[PDB]
Each structure stands twice: as structure tokens, then as C-alpha cells.
Amino acid sequence: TDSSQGIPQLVSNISACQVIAEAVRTTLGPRGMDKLIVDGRGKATISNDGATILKLLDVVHPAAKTLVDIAKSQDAEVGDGTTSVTLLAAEFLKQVKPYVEEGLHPQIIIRAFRTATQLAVNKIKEIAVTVKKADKVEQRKLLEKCAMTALSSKLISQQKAFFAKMVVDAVMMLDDLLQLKMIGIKKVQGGALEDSQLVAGVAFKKTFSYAGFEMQPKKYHNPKIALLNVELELKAEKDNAEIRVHTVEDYQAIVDAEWNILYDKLEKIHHSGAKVVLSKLPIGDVATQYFADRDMFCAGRVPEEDLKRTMMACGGSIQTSVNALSADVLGRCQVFEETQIGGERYNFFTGCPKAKTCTFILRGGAEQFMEETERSLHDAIMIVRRAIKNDSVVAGGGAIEMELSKYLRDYSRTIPGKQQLLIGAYAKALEIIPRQLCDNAGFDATNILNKLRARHAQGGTWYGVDINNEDIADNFEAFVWEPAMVRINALTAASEAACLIVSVDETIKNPR
Amino acid sequence: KLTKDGNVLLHEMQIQHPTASLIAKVATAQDDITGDGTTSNVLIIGELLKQADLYISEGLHPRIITEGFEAAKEKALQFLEEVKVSREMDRETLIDVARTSLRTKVHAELADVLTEAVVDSILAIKKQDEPIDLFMIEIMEMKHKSETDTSLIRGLVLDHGARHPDMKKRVEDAYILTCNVSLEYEKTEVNSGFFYKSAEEREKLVKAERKFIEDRVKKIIELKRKVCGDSDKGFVVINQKGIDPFSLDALSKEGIVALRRAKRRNMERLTLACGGVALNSFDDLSPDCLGHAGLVYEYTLGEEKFTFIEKCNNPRSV
């Protein structure tokens, strides 16, 4: 029944934002903690990504709603920088909180924040160094260094890095986007003799076998996948319907009357050229025999993702009819092979006219190695894509925030106005990345921040932080970098969010 | 709702005391005699009641108080009868009376443009020796953007007009005829208030109705051609039903205007001021029931054009 306007409203907004800021904080580094989320249904899920946690949580607060909306928009427009922007906004709010209750009009800090952001953007633009085909003689040395930088992220085997480089370098033909959400990846289960295999085509996993399944040819010269939503199962067709039970001739009569239409339909759908039937429902017992007697192919039980991949690779068309079809909405392949390894029957579709997707089989013969060690390859291919597509780059880690903070602190000592303390607080609030990294890594940030400040007091290089050796080394030599375009956008989004939060002075409710 | 009157307030209030409600009802029941006398009455009654209560508390009987009150009332009546004086009624006295009434009712701003119109209407209505009647003066209202806007029309006012304007408006000596026949009610097929199943009967009824409408419009056209034949002698028809545009064009081609959607009070005032017989036929009869009109004007404002008829016989409608 109590409400105010001005300082109490801003204090309440800051206190509400602090809750959602502290709710997600430990999930920032590469080895963050896991979180279990369970709704009212009864199924729980373990996740460690900040975006997945923010998407599965709703707040009944206007400031928190605007913050999570800005974070979702930034994650959808870019793809990196969701928790860092929230942490920066929370630190800015925590630094601006004591400079509000002392009788200060917040309309004078927006200009100072904008000038500081502009100066930081200008410094980042003038300090960024880009390199793309200008040295390292022929292009044969750039791919080697790219593969080395990709494998230096996670200490893995030598045979796994080469296969990853081959699978990431053989998919750069018609892809002109900035994300791997077009082709995608698919993890398989099982084991093989080798550790990893590569192929170009569609992949089909385990298929149920029956009696006489070897009657179909293993190799096809010019196969054509039959894109039909209907299936030929014992439940679809029928041999006895509503008929008068008298003698034994009525059964044969009705089964012949049905088989006439069945043969007409199958010959009409086979005369178009399609012969590789990919039925969604599993096959029965007599359907396989009927398909083998006509020297045709039969299948059953296939997921929707495999059908979509086949339609995208072979170039199939969506057919919404069973009969009265033509010979233009059908797919055309080239090589269809069936290779059984261990205890499964794998199927390969190689020779697609549209080189789009490729299969990267990773089977070592275990049940836990398939689920684990799956984020390292994703991070490696993401770093490779970011280094190939983007041109500008800079040293990653905590080597770019300390220099900006020192520059802002040195520049704030040349202004005779009220913006001195504002710029000082803005520069102090920028130190939140390496402290949080050291806190998540299980180290002592107090023993590293002092050394970083002492090294950056007169050096100004790319000396960041370490995790394995637990020391201070040059990030430019550790083969770890980051694009110089995501940080600018993240800082701009954080500044805009802070300005929008500090601009709101009160709220107005409406009962009816 | 803003108010300041005595009877209007006493009639629309929620009094929790039954005695006060009965007193207010008794006071309002005696307001239909004179003009406005419900105000400045409760104060004297309350003072007299307080004096009577004080005299009772002092020690007396209500009979002597009532006798003294009756004697004082008789003395006051005699004094008022002996102190009265006569004055010649003219224009300044009525002007001052209306000005004082407007000042006691409305603010001292627009109280100058209404008293003149009231005096003019009174002088135009009163001209005989019998007492006048407040039933021939119609007070209409409109919707405008300004505040001080008054008008004194010496004729009648018609809200509705015609669906096809822009033809003519300078009709001097016009003839008005009031009727109530079915000229064009609706194009939908009807019968006798009961739906049927066959369409031949209803289509034949519709064809017969159309033939009757054609015969009626031909009859009124020949009547207008017989009683006139030029452009100076105009004709105006008042009907409460609709009018088809295809027939309205043919009617206006010769010089006769037909109005649609007319209220009952409008035709009542028209037949009471002019004097016409309301029949249910469009036959060729005597032109004695046709009323005369001197000046007709069309005022275009808002979403509906108004009609002003004046310069008629016996101007007894302001």
C-alpha cells in the first residue's frame, strides 16, 4: 500500500536486478558448475549454459524482463556474450548506487557514460590489429597454424585434431553464413576398428532385419529415394474386410479384389522411377518378401531428421499425395552402400548432387565416451569458423579490460568537473572478468590482480591470466584470440541497458 | 449534473430523515401554482419553529401561538394589499424583469442576448386579449463548438431533408401536402407478416407493389403539372417512409421536392400551424388541404441538413 518515486524506485530496481545477476554467475568460464532445473511435470534437466538457464526462467519484474529480453536479443543477433553483459550491467548499477542517495541528478551521468563508451570504442578500434592473407608465404602454412590453434584449446590426441580439421575444411564450399546452424552435426553410437571416419552423404543408423533381407542388391548404380508418406505394413493394407462368411472362395475373391488395386498403385508409383522406398513405419513380415520378389528395396523405422537430411542433400521435394504422382518431385542419388560394423547395419548415401552435409562418425567402442568429450570439438570448430570468417581479432582473456581501465583512469585526471568520479567508477567497474575467472577456476584473485596491475602499469602488452600453470603469461603466444567486433557490440548493449535502467524513474499501474 | 435551483435539488436528493423528506415533498407539491417560489421558504419556517420551541420551553400553549401567527399573517396580508401599486406594462419593465431573472439563474455574462430574444418572442406571440399559452413555443437544442449562440426563428424547423441535395433552394410560394401512404418503405419482399414457401406469390406481390408505386408517382406528377406548370410555384411533400433515388430524380426534374423520414411532432406542428388534412391517398382532390409556405431555406451543418420554413400564414410558432 506504499509507493514512492525517484530514489526508492531506483533502489528497488537495482535490488531486483541484483537477484537475477547473482542467480547466474558461476556459469561463465569453460569449466562452470552445473544446474538442475525441474518444472511441475516431473522431469529434471542438467544444464550449464547461461542462455538455456535464462530461457527457462521468468521474472515478474519490469527491469529484469527488459534485461533478459536485451540478453536474448543480443544472443540471437550475435551468439556470444550473454552473461558478461549482465555482469557488467550489475557492476555498473552497484557502482552507481552510492552516487544516487547523495542528492545527484542522474541526467548528468548519461553523457559521461556515453563519452566513456565512445572513448573505449575508439581505443579498441585504434588498438585492433587484423591479419588475413598478407604473410606466411603460400596458404599451405595458414591451415597448419589454424589446426594448431584449434588443437591447442584442449589437449587431445593427434589423430583427433587432424580429422576435425579435415571435417571443418571440407564443408567450406557454398556456406556463406557466420554460424554452423545450417549443416549441423550428429553424434552416433557404437564402435568400429578406427577412432573416427569421414564420409560425404546421408547416414542411416540401425535398421531392423528380417528373414531374407539379403535379397536386395548392396550397391546401386542410380538409386532414387521414394518420397512417399504412406507405408506398406500389415496395418496399412488388408486381406479380409467386411464380407459374408460362407465358404473359402469369398476370402480369395476379396483378397484378389484388394491385390488388384494394390498392384495398380504400386506399379503406378514405381513407373515414375522411384525404387528406394523409405517408409516411416517399420516393415512387416510379408511386405519384405513381396518387395524382394519384385526386385525392389524396402525399409522402415526412420527418424525425421534423417528424412530432412536426405531431402536437403539429395534435393527432394515435399509430396502431399499418394497416387497420381509425376517424375519431377522425386530424388536422385548415385551410390547407396550398406556396411555392417560390430553390431549394427550402417547405411551410406554417397554421391549427392548437392554437397551440403557430411557424416563425421566418432565411434570408439564405449558407452560414456560418446556423450562426453563433445564440447571440445564444438568449441574448436567455433573458433575455427570465427577465425576464418571474421577478419579483425585481438588477444583474448583478461588482457583487454585492464588496459582500457588504466587508460580511462589516466584520462580522468585531466577534466575539471563532476565527471571525474563518474569516469573513475566506470573504469573501476570494468574489472569483473579476470576476478570472476579466477574465482571460478578455484584460485586466489587477490594474488593475481595485483600482479596484473603491476605488469600493466608500464608494459601495455597482451599479458592475461592462466588456468593450468596458474600464473601470468602472454595471451598472444598461448594461441587464444577473440574477434574485435563482439566486444564492441557487447559494451554498446551493456551501456544501452544501463542507460535504459537509469532513465526509468517511476512506474504507473492501472487496475481496470 | 450542475444545479442551483430549489425544486430541482429538492426533487433529486437522498434525505435520510423522514420528516425532512415529508417537508420537502410538501414544499414541492405547492410549486405548480406560481412560477418559482420553492426557495426562500425553509428559512422563515425554521425561524418560526425555533421561536415557537423557545416560547414552549419558556411556558406557553401552542393555541395562543397559532392565533398570534394567524393574526400576524392577516395583518401582513392587509399591509401587502394596501401597499401595492400599479405600473404601465411596456418594454423596459419586461426587459428588466427578464434581466433580473437571468442574473438570478445564470451568470452575469450571457444574460444580455437571451432577454432580448425572450421579449421579442413574447411580443410576437402575444397580440390578443386572452391569456397566452406556453405550448406554441418549441425550444430545440443542437451541438456546436462555441458557447454563446442563440437564434429566434419565426417559422418551423425540420430536422431531416433529402438524400440527393444540390438542386434548388429559392422556392417562394410553396405548397405543402401531408400524407402517410406507402411510397417506398423497403425493397425487401413481404406479404402479410407471415413467411411462406412459394416465391411466385411474393414476386407477384412485389411486382404489384412496384406497379402501384409507379401509378402513385405518375399521379402526383400529373397533379403537380396541373396545379402548377412553371418553376416559381413549387411543391414540397412530407413522408415518413423512404424515397427511391430513381424516382426522386424524375420528381426533381419537374420541380417538386419530397422529404423522407419525418417525425410525428413535425407533421403535427405543420398541420396545426398551416391547417391541412392528413389523408392516406395521392388522388386528385381539392387543393384546400394544401398549406402555403412563403420562404424555405436549407441550413447545412453537421451530418444532417435542416429546413427552415417561414413567411407562412398566421405566424404563431417561434
Binding site: 541528478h105 504507473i508 492501472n510 487496475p511 | 449534473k1 433529486e12 437522498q14 425532512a20
Partner: protein
């Protein structure tokens, strides 16, 4: 006790208390704005979208008050909004200041009639002395920068960041139709929203602009008569299910053939009657688009109630959502309908201008749907401000430079006539010092020093406090050469409405009872 039923607290003592406190509490939630500042307020009602606004119009249109003193001002606000373009918070601030200054006079011991008479005399004197501070005037309205400066000055009140491109676009859209001389309409300019790039890629285009795709053929003829309809592609034949799996193919094929023949006869009757194109407002079908492509008939896809409402209020047709093929009774005046490709989207263009009553539609584009509202508000405010119905606008140096001069003139005039009418004149003169105070308090500095500086320089009437930091403490700037002027008739109407509202409030002030059931 005798009249009320323990509902309202009215009597012979609430007049010099509640009737003023209600207006004070109503006006206190409004002084935070008024000026180029960033004080956005969120509005939560029924849309459930959480949008922030800055103007007080949308704030007052959503707040529900239950007091007659607060409802007596929204009527004057709506009247002022319907009359001229801007002008809303000025009347409220003036009424609040007048009530706060009359509270002291009522507490001292003076009747309300003398205060009303003094206020009326002061208002008459202000209205008489108002036509005397005319500096600049409108020269020729056929130029570009002459109206662009005024448009920029009007837009600077709302948006402070971007205001040149929008002003130039509004000037180009207004100069391409008709000027203020002769006849100029307001409901002939439409604003369309396009979800694509930012606001740095807008353009202008004359004629109708609608985001509607075309799955047929380009019909650039003049005989293509329009035919608007509600939902013609709804469902004239309702099909049900007999069994669970599937029914006999013969009945389904017969029903499909019958529906195809019916729709073919329908489109043939609608095309042979004198209508080449048809405006649909339902779903689509394979055979429908097939017939539309094989019959050379343009078929739309996007449907909206606003589009059909505008087409009905502009042309004058009527939709006929009937099953049987009707007759052609929607003949309009359009004939030249062309197609254009803007932003990889198909748009329609109508050409039917005969050098009279031309229309225009500016192309707007932004990031989200919560940012184009302020742009549209600024556009319509500038359009309403451009309309003045006079060749010479007679602009006056606004922003507070004229209020101090008017107050000084009223103070000098009141110190002449004797009697008990000087207190009301002094109060009306002192009430004019509420515009510079609210502008100085919403910046960052105080207002007493600003008022002292404005009163200590000179009585020129062209000095006002700026917006930058180098113009807050000194507040010595010449707004005549900068280009900051205001409407002459707008301030007059605002003062008149404020005086009328104050008179109405001070008049009706006694006992608020109730009505019987």
C-alpha cells in the same frame, strides 16, 4: 449525517483543502516531464507488453481517476488537443499554480467573488497585451529550410538525438502535396511500419503504400476494378468425417470436382462482370492459386482489418461475404495500380491524383515495434504543428522568455488601480513563474539562481536558459538567432482554457452530495 451516507468527506470545510489537494496530487505526477529530458515511464494496462512513453497524453489516457476536480481538467485537455496540435501540460501547470496561490488568499480571509473578478481582469489584460511581442514571421512556404527549421524546433521537444532527418522527411512529404494556403487536409497522410533495417534508411513515396504480396501476375491495366471482400476464401462447402481412417475415394473426388466447378464458375462470373482483380481476406489453396495464375488474376495474401477499413473509408465500397456470386456494386475511382519492389517486398502503388486532394505515405522502418511509436508520435505532432491555417504564423520567442515579460507587465499594471483587486493580480502575475522553474529543476541545477539571472539582465524578452552545461548557471543566451520559437495562437488558447478551468473550479465549490436511486 443528513444528506450523504458516509461516502464522501464533503462539507463546509473541505473546500479550502481537498479541492486543492486533489489537483496538487494530480499535477505532481506530471512536472517530471515538460522539456527535452529522458524521463520515460512504463505503462502497464491490458496489452501486457511493457512499453515506456514520454508524452503525458498516453499517460493521462491510461490513468483512471475517481474525483470530479481531477475530471474537470481532462475535458479541457481533450478540448485543447482537439483544437490545436500540442499544448497539454501548460494548462495543468497553470491551474495548479493558480490553485496553490489562491489557497493562501482563501486562508487569509477573502471572498471568492473578488478573486474571480481579479483573475478575469488579469486574464483580459494578458489577452490584450499578448499581441505585442511578435518578432519573426513566416515568409514563403514554398521553400525547404524555412519550414525545416520549425519542424526541427518542434521535434527537438520530443526526441533529442535524431531530429534533422525526420524533420526533412516531414517537410518533403508536406511540400509534395499542398501548402497552408488554400486548403490542406490532415487525414491524407498515412504511416506504414516495415520490419527490416533501422531508421537510417527511410524514404518517401506518393500514393498508397501497403505491404501485400502477389502470387499471380502483374496487372498494369486501367480496367482492373477493385472488389473488396470480407472472407471470400473461407469455406463454402463444409466437409465432415464418416469413418476413422479414410472414406471412399469416389465421394471425395466428386466433392472436389464439384467445389472446383463452383469456384471456377464464381471466378468466371466475378471476372466477366467487370472486375479483373479481387481483394481476398482469408486463406489460400493450391487450386485457388492455380486458377489465379491461369486466369491472370492478382491474388493477395496479407489481410488486416485496418487495410480494409481504410479501403472502405477512402474508395467507398462494401464487402459482400456471400456464398452465391453477387453482382458488381463496388465500382470505385482507382484504375492505375502498379507493383514495386522495396526491401525485397512487394508493395502496391495507386495513382489517381488530378492536382487536387493528393495523398502521401512515408516509409518507416525500425528495429522492434516498441520504437516506431515515438517516431509516429513525433511525425503526427510535427504535421499538426505545421497546420496553422494562416500565411503569417507570427512566431514568438517561446521557452520562457515571454512568460517573465508578461508577468512583469501584469505586475506593473496591477500597481495602479486601488481597491481589493491587487492581490489577485499579483497572484496571477506570480503564477507565470512556473515554466522556467520546472525547466531548471528537470536539468540538474537549481531554479532560484536561474530566475535571479533572468530578472537581473534586462527586460528584452529574448533570453532563456539553455540545455548544455555551459548554459545552466549563466542562462544568458539569445534564442532569436538560434531558431527556438513557439505558436502564437497555441499559447493564447492554452491560457484561455486554463483561465476557464480555474474559474469553473473556483465557482463550483461547496457540498458534493449524491443522487437518489
Amino acid at each position: 449525517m443528513l444528506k450523504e451516507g458516509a461516502k464522501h468527506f464533503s462539507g463546509l470545510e473541505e473546500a479550502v483543502y481537498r479541492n486543492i489537494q486533489a489537483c496538487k496530487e494530480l499535477a505532481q505526477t506530471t512536472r517530471t516531464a515538460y522539456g527535452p529530458n529522458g524521463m520515460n515511464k512504463m505503462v502497464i494496462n491490458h496489452l501486457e507488453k511493457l512499453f515506456v512513453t514520454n508524452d503525458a497524453a498516453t499517460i493521462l489516457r491510461e490513468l483512471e481517476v475517481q474525483h470530479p476536480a481531477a475530471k474537470m481538467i481532462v475535458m479541457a485537455s481533450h478540448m485543447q488537443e482537439q483544437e490545436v496540435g500540442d499544448g497539454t501540460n501548460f494548462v495543468l501547470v497553470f491551474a495548479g499554480a493558480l490553485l496553490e496561490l489562491a489557497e493562501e488568499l482563501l486562508r487569509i480571509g477573502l471572498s471568492v467573488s473578488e478573486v474571480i473578478e481579479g483573475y478575469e481582469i488579469a486574464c483580459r489584460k494578458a489577452h490584450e497585451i499578448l499581441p505585442n511581442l511578435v518578432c519573426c514571421s513566416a515568409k514563403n512556404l514554398r521553400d525547404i529550410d524555412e519550414v525545416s527549421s520549425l519542424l526541427r524546433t518542434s521535434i527537438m521537444s520530443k526526441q533529442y538525438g535524431n531530429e534533422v532527418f525526420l524533420a526533412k522527411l516531414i517537410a518533403q512529404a508536406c511540400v509534395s502535396i499542398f501548402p497552408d494556403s488554400g486548403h490542406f487536409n490532415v487525414d491524407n497522410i498515412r504511416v506504414c511500419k516495415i520490419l527490416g533495417s533501422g531508421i537510417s534508411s527511410s524514404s518517401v513515396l506518393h500514393g498508397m503504400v501497403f505491404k501485400k504480396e502477389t502470387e499471380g501476375d502483374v496487372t498494369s491495366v486501367k480496367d482492373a476494378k477493385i472488389a473488396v471482400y470480407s472472407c471470400p476464401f473461407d469455406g463454402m462447402i463444409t466437409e465432415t468425417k464418416g469413418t476413422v481412417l479414410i472414406k471412399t475415394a469416389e465421394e471425395l473426388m466428386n466433392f472436389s470436382k464439384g467445389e472446383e466447378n463452383l469456384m471456377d464458375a464464381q471466378v468466371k462470373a466475378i471476372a466477366d462482370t467487370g472486375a479483373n482483380v479481387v481483394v481476398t481476406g482469408g486463406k489460400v489453396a493450391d487450386m485457388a492459386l492455380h486458377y489465379a495464375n491461369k486466369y491472370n488474376i492478382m491474388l493477395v495474401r496479407l489481410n488486416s482489418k485496418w487495410d480494409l477499413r481504410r479501403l472502405c473509408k477512402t474508395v467507398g465500397a462494401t464487402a459482400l461475404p456471400r456464398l452465391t456470386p453477387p453482382v458488381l456494386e463496388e465500382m470505385g475511382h482507382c484504375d492505375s495500380v502498379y507493383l514495386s519492389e522495396v526491401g525485397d517486398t512487394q508493395v502496391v502503388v495507386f495513382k489517381h491524383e488530378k492536382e487536387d486532394g493528393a495523398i502521401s505515405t512515408i516509409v518507416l522502418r525500425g528495429s522492434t515495434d516498441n520504437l516506431m511509436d515515438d517516431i509516429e508520435r513525433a511525425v503526427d505532432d510535427g504535421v499538426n504543428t505545421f497546420k496553422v491555417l494562416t500565411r503569417d504564423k507570427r512566431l514568438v520567442p517561446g521557452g520562457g522568455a515571454t512568460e517573465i515579460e508578461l508577468a512583469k507587465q501584469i505586475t506593473s499594471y496591477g500597481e495602479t488601480c486601488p481597491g481589493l483587486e491587487q492581490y489577485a493580480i499579483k497572484k496571477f502575475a506570480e503564477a507565470f513563474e512556473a515554466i522556467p522553474r520546472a525547466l531548471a529543476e528537470n536539468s540538474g541545477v537549481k531554479a532560484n539562481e536561474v530566475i535571479s539571472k533572468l530578472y537581473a539582465v534586462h527586460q528584452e524578452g529574448n533570453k532563456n536558459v539553455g540545455l548544455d552545461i555551459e548554459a545552466e548557471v549563466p542562462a544568458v543566451k539569445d534564442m532569436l538567432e538560434a531558431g527556438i520559437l513557439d505558436t502564437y495562437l497555441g499559447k493564447y488558447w492554452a491560457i484561455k482554457l486554463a483561465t476557464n478551468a480555474a474559474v469553473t473550479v473556483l465557482r463550483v465549490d461547496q457540498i458534493i452530495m449524491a443522487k437518489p436511486a
